[PDB]
Amino acid sequence: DTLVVTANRFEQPRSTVLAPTTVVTRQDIDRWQSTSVNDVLRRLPGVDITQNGGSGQLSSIFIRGTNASHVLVLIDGVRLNLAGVSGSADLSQFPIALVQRVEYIRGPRSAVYGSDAIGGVVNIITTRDEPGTEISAGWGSNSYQNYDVSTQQQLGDKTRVTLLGDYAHTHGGFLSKTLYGALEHNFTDAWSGFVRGYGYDNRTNTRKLYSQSWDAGLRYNGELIKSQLITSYSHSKDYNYSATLDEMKQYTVQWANNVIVGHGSIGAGVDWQKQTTTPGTGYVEDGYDQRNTGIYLTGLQQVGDFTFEGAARSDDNSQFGRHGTCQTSAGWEFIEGYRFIASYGTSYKAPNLGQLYGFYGNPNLDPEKSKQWEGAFEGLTAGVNWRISGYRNDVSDLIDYDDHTLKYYNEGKARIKGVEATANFDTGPLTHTVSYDYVDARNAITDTPLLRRAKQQVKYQLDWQLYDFDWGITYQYLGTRYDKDYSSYPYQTVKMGGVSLWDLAVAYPVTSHLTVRGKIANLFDKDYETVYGYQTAGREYTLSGSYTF
Numbered sequence: 217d218t219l220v221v222t223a224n225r226f227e228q229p230r231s232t233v234l235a236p237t238t239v240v241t242r243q244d245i246d247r248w249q250s251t252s253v254n255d256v257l258r259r260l261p262g263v264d265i266t267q268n269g270g271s272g273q274l275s276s277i278f279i280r281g282t283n284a285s286h287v288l289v290l291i292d293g294v295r296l297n298l299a300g301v302s303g304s305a306d307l308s309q310f311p312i313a314l315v316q317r318v319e320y321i322r323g324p325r326s327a328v329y330g331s332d333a334i335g336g337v338v339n340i341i342t343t344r345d346e347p348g349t350e351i352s353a354g355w356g357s358n359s360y361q362n363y364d365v366s367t368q369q370q371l372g373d374k375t376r377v378t379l380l381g382d383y384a385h386t387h388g389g390f391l392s393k394t395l396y397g398a399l400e401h402n403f404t405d406a407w408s409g410f411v412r413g414y415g416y417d418n419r420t421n422t423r424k425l426y427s428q429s430w431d432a433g434l435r436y437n438g439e440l441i442k443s444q445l446i447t448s449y450s451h452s453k454d455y456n457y458s459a460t461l462d463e464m465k466q467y468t469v470q471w472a473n474n475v476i477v478g479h480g481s482i483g484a485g486v487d488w489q490k491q492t493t494t495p496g497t498g499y500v501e502d503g504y505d506q507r508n509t510g511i512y513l514t515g516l517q518q519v520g521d522f523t524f525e526g527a528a529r530s531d532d533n534s535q536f537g538r539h540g541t542c543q544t545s546a547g548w549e550f551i552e553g554y555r556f557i558a559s560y561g562t563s564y565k566a567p568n569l570g571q572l573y574g575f576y577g578n579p580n581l582d583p584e585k586s587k588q589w590e591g592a593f594e595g596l597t598a599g600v601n602w603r604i605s606g607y608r609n610d611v612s613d614l615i616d617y618d619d620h621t622l623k624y625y626n627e628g629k630a631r632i633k634g635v636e637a638t639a640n641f642d643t644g645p646l647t648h649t650v651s652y653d654y655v656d657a658r659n660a661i662t663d664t665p666l667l668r669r670a671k672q673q674v675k676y677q678l679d680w681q682l683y684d685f686d687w688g689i690t691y692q693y694l695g696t697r698y699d700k701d702y703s704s705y706p707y708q709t710v711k712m713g714g715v716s717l718w719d720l721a722v723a724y725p726v727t728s729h730l731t732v733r734g735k736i737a738n739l740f741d742k743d744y745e746t747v748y749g750y751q752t753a754g755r756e757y758t759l760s761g762s763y764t765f
């Protein structure tokens with residue numbers, strides 16, 4: 217199988233991770249011709265993305281019916297800094313040109329990573345191993361324009377340098393400029409070090425976002441033992457124009473180890489994080505300094521037809537103190553190629569600055585808490601790889617605005633019951649990748665459905681190659697959703713009808729160096745919204761190329 221590092225921080229085959237797992241490579245992203253992260257993500261199981269319009273507009277990610285703030289987004293294994301002020305991940309500003317791989321694991325994972333990993337985890341990896349220089353560019357609808365240069369070069373054997381530059385610009389709009397460098401060095405065959413730095417300057421209509429991140433690390437990859445020590449600094453500055461500045465610095469230091477033992481592994485690590493915000497950030501008066509340290513244990517073992525996986529973690533947070541989480545999954549391969557999996561896991565979400573210290577702050581709030589149970593069957597039948605999972609997620613201690621006392625409190629519960637079905641198979645030269653999600657996400661106290669969430673989704677990718685034309689068709693059904701209408705007070709909840717959407721993409725190797733690509737997004741120009749009142753794109757055309765040398 218393809219490897220992931222996201223389940224326990226170290227490489228393992230994805231057949232040994234029991235939680236459902238999706239991997240997107242750069243090759244997929246080039247064929248899809250995605251011009252944003254959201255477009256990559258909306259394609260995958262359990263993902264419901266809403267957006268205040270097109271590219272660059274604020275967005276929310278609802279994994280498996282959970283709140284916007286209950287997905288953990290990592291960049292190269294570190295909590296996305298853009299999410300630090302608001303406490304909820306928004307990838308609409310993150311440059312797609314940095315995205316080399318996505319590992320997405322559904323279900324909880326606080327027991328490895330701490331806060332936010334309730335619905336699942338999305339790790340965006342920016343590292344590639346692909347020697348050479350490449351030039352790319354695109355033109356499309358709304359004066360869309362992209363230029364991109366990158367290279368990877370040995371500087372002597374043992375060392376290599378990566379550089380990337382990207383400019384993307386789209387009127388009505390959204391402008392984004394990105395720069396990335398890395399140095400990778402192999403001290404021995406087992407020992408390695410790296411320093412990575414990147415930044416992007418975005419403008420959106422007037423919002424002005426700038427972010428930089430620097431990472432530095434040491435890894436040991438032995439025959440049995442693996443170790444990693446990584447430090448990370450991020451600094452973002454977010455201007456809105458009267459005058460609002462949100463600024464945050466995030467520091468991380470993590471040390472993990474993992475050893476192969478019996479038929480599997482055992483791991484442990486320690487994780488430290490500091491976030492400082494500047495006065496006035498998040499409509500909070502003072503600057504804050506929040507700290508967290510966690511310690512966790514992981515395990516995986518195969519015995520006969522059974523697989524057991526687990527993680528357990530204790531976090532010590534400077535505001536709410538101590539919270540412990542744990543996860544266990546057992547799988548049973550009862551006949552060759554078929555498997556039942558049962559999982560249980562707790563996870564949490566930390567209070568955010570606004571909830572804590574804003575005008576309606578409550579400095580004594582506790583984390584939001586999740587308990588999740590999941591059961592799955594997977595199999596390989598007649599060339600079809602498939603899986604069907606049912607899950608229940610009880611969330612409690614939700615942080616809610618109390619209008620009577622003008623303060624946030626822990627109160628309030630949600631019950632989510634869902635089914636995920638996926639399959640992939642070929643029929644002659646055709647490859648089919650399909651998924652179906654049912655999500656019944658409610659307020660558990662009133663029994664009413666949560667807003668902003670599609671109860672059902674169907675997703676289908678159909679790929680094939682005919683001459684030297686490589687074709688991809690993308691279909692999605694976004695089901696019924698409820699939302700509030702803010703044009704009239706009191707704001708009333710409205711029912712937004714299901715919608716089907718189609719994209720067509722093609723690529724062609726003009727020569728061995730030159731690939732040209734075309735896309736039509738929203739082929740039937742379907743008029744729809746994912747947030748009530750905010751119009752989405754309509755039919756758009758892209759045309760691009762890349763040249764390798």
Ligand SMILES: CCCCCCCCOCCOCCOCCOCCO
Pocket residue numbers: 477478479481482515516517
């Ligand atoms: C009363 C319920 C609480 C149970 C918590 C027990 C924690 C689970 O671990 C039990 C001990 O098993 C450790 C196995 O370690 C896994 C890998 O190494 C063994 C290689 O075969």
Ligand SMILES: CCCCCCCCOCCOCCOCCOCCO
Pocket residue numbers: 482513514515516517524525526527528542543544545
């Ligand atoms: C020696 C302990 C190393 C493994 C501890 C990680 C497991 C976290 O605890 C979860 C409790 O679940 C009960 C254990 O049964 C499942 C086994 O988990 C896989 C470890 O082999």
Ligand SMILES: CCCCCCCCOCCOCCOCCOCCO
Pocket residue numbers: 513528542
């Ligand atoms: C590596 C081991 C991980 C497995 C540990 C999970 C087992 C938890 O056991 C029960 C916990 O009991 C909670 C203690 O009570 C304090 C708070 O609730 C009190 C209610 O009045």
Ligand SMILES: CCCCCCCCOCCOCCOCCOCCO
Pocket residue numbers: 484511512513528529530539540541542
């Ligand atoms: C390498 C060690 C990793 C151990 C982390 C264990 C995390 C266990 O968290 C499970 C939650 O358990 C519920 C009770 O925890 C509250 C603390 O209670 C201890 C004092 O009463």
Ligand SMILES: CCCCCCCCOCCOCCOCCOCCO
Pocket residue numbers: 551554555593594595
């Ligand atoms: C919900 C879990 C699914 C459980 C039912 C599926 C288990 C099916 O087992 C099928 C065994 O395979 C029989 C197929 O025929 C054999 C193929 O050719 C073998 C060479 O002679």
Ligand SMILES: CCCCCCCCOCCOCCOCCOCCO
Pocket residue numbers: 591592593604605606607608633634635
């Ligand atoms: C391994 C089981 C996979 C679940 C597949 C769907 C089966 C549905 O049939 C049972 C009836 O469903 C009752 C309500 O379903 C919504 C619950 O979603 C699952 C979480 O409990």
Ligand SMILES: CCCCCCCCOCCOCCOCCOCCO
Pocket residue numbers: 602603604635637638639650651652
């Ligand atoms: C899918 C339920 C029947 C047993 C599993 C068969 C293999 C699943 O592959 C399905 C992939 O396609 C999704 C279609 O889903 C319709 C059934 O959804 C389950 C509703 O509870």
Ligand SMILES: *SCC1=CC(C)(C)N(O)C1(C)C
Pocket residue numbers: 541542543544560561562
């Ligand atoms: S959170 C890990 C877990 C698994 C199971 C054995 C069902 N448990 O009782 C706990 C809650 C320890």
Ligand SMILES: [Mg+2]
Pocket residue numbers: 359385387
């Ligand atoms: Mg212009």
Ligand SMILES: [Mg+2]
Pocket residue numbers: 437438439440441
């Ligand atoms: Mg070794």
Ligand SMILES: [Mg+2]
Pocket residue numbers: 536580581582
């Ligand atoms: Mg408390």
